[model samples]
Target chain A: MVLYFIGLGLYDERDITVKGLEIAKKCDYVFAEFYTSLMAGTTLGRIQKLIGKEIRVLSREDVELNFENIVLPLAKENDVAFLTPGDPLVATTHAELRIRAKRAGVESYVIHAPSIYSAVGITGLHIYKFGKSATVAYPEGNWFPTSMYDVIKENAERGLHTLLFLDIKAEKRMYMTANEAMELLLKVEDMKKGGVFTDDTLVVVLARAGSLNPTIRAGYVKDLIREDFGDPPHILIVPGKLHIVEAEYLVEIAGAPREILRVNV
Target chain B: MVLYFIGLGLYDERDITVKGLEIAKKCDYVFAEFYTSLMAGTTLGRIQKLIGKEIRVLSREDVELNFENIVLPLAKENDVAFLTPGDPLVATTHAELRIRAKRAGVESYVIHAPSIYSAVGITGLHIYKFGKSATVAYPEGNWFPTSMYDVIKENAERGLHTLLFLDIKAEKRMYMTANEAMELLLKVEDMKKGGVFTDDTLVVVLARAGSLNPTIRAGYVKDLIREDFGDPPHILIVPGKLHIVEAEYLVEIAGAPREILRVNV
Candidate 1:
């Protein structure tokens, strides 16, 4: 009669909140999807072991197309949990699933966890300075998306930082690296001639967030576009005018260029 | 010697992640501050019981003025953990503390947790659509701040949502409720006359996020201004134009007015 939308946190099995774990242990059925974002540090076996349940892994299509048919029915007779990477419904369209549960006469609850949306704070940027976020998608045949480019531009115009969620094809096991996102932005700049993204533009890269030693680097695009951020599940950040404290953090902690400490403001 | 910055998640002791819990338990000293934000669903005693440690609570002055003197010196000899509500360094100035650690030759690691910043996802609004966030400070003495009011207007101009974190005096145990936030915004509207916030403006209130049963409600300010949200630590959101799917989620799950389903966009 109830459904729980549990977040598995950012990277590893242990990242799941105690609340989510305890609730999942009591749940009769556990269903999870990784296509939204991958937990690069842990595997299905580890997550299942931690929850002490047999998790039925679902695909993007499985959850999006048939959540009511595949999951809500069981929710009627059992306490079901739909687990996802990071906080459920933050960056994903899964919030609509609650509407589906309500339509099926099942109550749903969300157990929050660490999401990259907030984890980006580790980069030392003021979380409040972040503006509208966008995803950097791999341009398919005849469909190059440049909306993310405009997002960064608009945010920068207002002296607000932009968080770019690199695209991922979890089924194909393909994750877009921050390097690729930077290259893609440059390509869009070439097309639009907006000067929105250039080699000298400063960017911050966070890899495998929620891990204790996740890689945090900040530098110009030319310097970091080809640098290794270590692993899959990377995010890119383009900051606007920085505060002195923010610049110092990027320089001292994130390995940003010392010159970045000289902010115009 | 290392310093661990751990988040105790949003509402309760169990809201903390397994990773944070394990690390915090192993720490020789645990220091926490509740001034930046409060966990209304749990008490300091409950947090201490879960962590199996006696927490030395710090005031705002202790953390901001003497974190190095109070926390860093202890971190030099033993593994010390600085606990805070929500993710560390996200909304708080504690990120600068990492710099202090570096200067003092003490290493620091951040363990992420559920933050109200991301917990706002439960509001059924698209998180990525949120623009720069602001804090709604309570009027004190002769100072009546309205920067949060301008943040809403600026974000709305760009068709983006604005997240307003209400003020709190943790030492005094004074929390600014969503109703008070609405009244403040209305007052700002009366002064600015920008149509930024008024009785007719749409808003969403999320109270005690990260709890099993949080209060989620959306409506025009006039309808919900005096409505009870049940607790302290409430957050208000001024959503921009909504997508059809977003509107559906709000209407179905958040108890939004039925008319909201007919969004302009």
Candidate 2:
């Protein structure tokens, strides 16, 4: 028996790799892990229509705790595809499961696909600039882990882009709305005051990254926090020092305010 | 007139987003900058076939020496599609060019796509654990930039991954081969006694990412340093600390050495 960790990539139905779709078709059970990247338009109806296979979804709770009930036992007996919104293994939980499968004497293979985290590299922002990657939770709490502040702060102080991962809860049918998230950080910025983010700070916001309607806007934190880019699976990036061009891009293309273009300030 | 920066994405011709394709079609002049990401499978002939347009190919030098040549002149008069491999603005040069365009009054937009860099996150490695993001240059005058050593050292100290973007003289077809790069790193390790990578250290050698024939091999750094994975656009991941699952995947699925199970020693 084999378990394949499949990455469904960004948006829509065909986002699933041919390889992933091929494997998913043969599996007795198919479950998706969505705590990481969000599959914005990938509803069960859409997946059912596109993948043309029987699939059962594993919620954040299912994979996080009920692994024994589903992925593990089924994987040992039949072909199982453990799927995720982005790439499956991008989440440590999936990785841990692969390792646990090895311990349990199960065989597995990873089918690679395109994901947003790697998209960060294309920004010429230096993929390694991100520190302590964190995500924005749902609107349930007055305070979530703005722990991203310290991470963004430390990296920015050294001239790195913070690769923020926005969280998504497919079960709740709520993607981490970017406006809500940037506001969360804006609140953090206000609270930290001169520590992490300032209103004039620059951030790169990405909406619907892999889709046809994708939008990228870079500008001051305050403006981005309020501006409506209108899409799901959105991201906000608080940039550090720029290398002249990066600064220029934020201003001209991303709508950043030039007055805030302090290179190393 | 607006200059659109669009990513062609990974794989064959159709991987480009509809919006990116539309933006490119709408532009007056279409030029592609290929330093950061290279289109997989779809050759120049195929690209012309797919897009149904003529595209001027720009060398890295053409981009660098813009002050002496046609950057402003072309951008000023026309709505240009600045096409790129994967995501349009992932490369620093493109971002800088947008800055140049903005200064020259050329409007700009970015149509993003998936590049090879996205594969790293699939490994379940922390996105924040990368540093500097250096590229390995081709055979220099008998010496190389040991600067990459510092980049690796920094990431290793924090248990981050170091993404090495290999240098490419694309027109010359002299992309820095990954095997040579691994050997070069070994030499640096020998010079500094970095011990950060022994021959037994795990490395992920991804060849032809975003293509149907993409190959991902994980093995000892020493062993992989000599491996000849096919094609250009390869990504080398020198991981810092592996989660138990990533380590397990390497050993069990990717052929990582069994000794990785005892990395603490």
Candidate 3:
């Protein structure tokens, strides 16, 4: 029995890698690890509708909890896919699963598809510039994660960029916005060190990526906070150091004025 | 002309979003950003065949310099898609193009696709557990940045996993190996004072995700460095604190040795 780890890509049902699509067509069992992230526009029903294949959506409590029996037996029995959105390994769980599969003497293969990681390179900003990313969850009572700011601040010192993955609950479909996240980052900046972060911090915000009508804008955090970037699944970027090429691109192409960019001499 | 940032999700031309597919079917001038990343088991020629459209492939230089003249003018006159491999906005340049289009009073749109970022949550790792990410680029020398190691290390200190995005030269169709990347991390660990990492660090390597058959393995850095992981577009992860859920997933789902895990109150 062969197991397929299909990445549904970024957008919807058809985004599955070519290999993934073929596997989905042939698989006896197709399950999604829904506890991690929701497919948003590409739900279990829609994908089923497209391919005429039935996809059983696994609950978080099931996959993350009972993965051993769930995955192994399925792989041993027939063609199965622990389907995920985007590329699967970006999350630690998928990587771990492969390790176990190797030990069990079960065969597995990955289909390559487009992922946000590869797209990060196209920003004209060096891929080396992105720092460790963190999702700023909803507001807590003085218990938010301010440590992410330090990481971004450090990236700034090194002239890197910090990517903030907005937190979302796929089942409930609740998501954090770039604007709300900036509000917290601003507060966290001050909390960590006095007057460390301000509204003037240059940032980039993207919303509804993978869709035809997405939004990308660059400016100071405060101004950005005021800008309604439209819709869910947003990502926030805090650029640290800027190479001349990146800086010029931001100014000439991305709408950042000279003042907003922190460029080197 | 409208500049349409299109994502050819995964696979041949058929995988593009409905909106993108519609536009590509009848565009006056179509330019694709092809070199940074390409489709697997699918080529430009093959994509052209499937889509029944002739798309002019844009080089890195072509897209960077003459973007407005070549793409924008067409967008201004009719419709143009700033085509990308996976998700259009995965790279900043696509966004840069959109910003430029907006400035020129050219209407712009983005067709979302399946990207790796969406895979994180679907893979069962707590989406919030990941910190900043770094890339391993080739042509190894002073020009290649080693500072990325520190970014992942910083994430590790906070008990957050660090996702390592391996670099690829699409023009040459060359991909970096996960083993090579883990070894590089070891060197970075050796260089830092009071290093946060060591040769024995637990790491997971995920290769050729989204493919029909995907592989995942977990071992110490040294162990993975000696192993052969198949295919291109590999990614590495250095996990931080593994929760009971996380630990169980690795041990059960990923088949982790209890000996390798740290048990604490």
- Give the DockQ (2 decimals) of all models: 0.91, 0.27, 0.29
- Residues B1-265, candidate 1: write the lDDT tens digits: 9999999999999999999999999999999999888888889999999999999999889988998899999899999999999999886488999999999999999999999899999888999999999999989899999899999999999999999999898888998999999999999899999989988888999999988888999989999999999976799999999998878777787778888877524
Docking class of 2: acceptable
- At residue A257, give the lDDT of candidate 1: 87
Residue B255 error for model 2, in Å? 1.4
Q: Can you write out model 2's per-residue Cα lDDT over A1-265, one digit (the tens) per residue? A: 7877766766766565555666678777777765565677657677776667767867677877877667878878898877777655556566667667776777776665556776554344545455445566554656557667777876676566777777776556676766777777777777778567776666788788666456777776666667888768787677677766565555665565676466433
Residue-level lDDT of model 3, residues A12-33, one tens digit each, is: 6655544567667788888777
Task: Estimate, for each residue in A1-265, the C-alpha lDDT of model 1 and write its tens digit.
Answer: 6999999999999999999999999999999998899898999999999999999999988888999999999999999999999999789989888888999999888999999999999999999999999999989999899899999999999999999999999878899999999999999999998877899999999999999899999999999998999998999999999999999999999999899889996
Tens-digit lDDT string for candidate 2 (B207-240): 7765544666787776777777887677777888
Ten residues in a row with the worst lDDT in model 1 chain B? Answer: B256-265
Provide candidate 3's TM-score on chain A: 0.90
Decide which is better by TM-score, 2 or 3: 2
The TM-score measured for candidate 2 stands at 0.77
Give model 2's DockQ, 2 decimals: 0.27
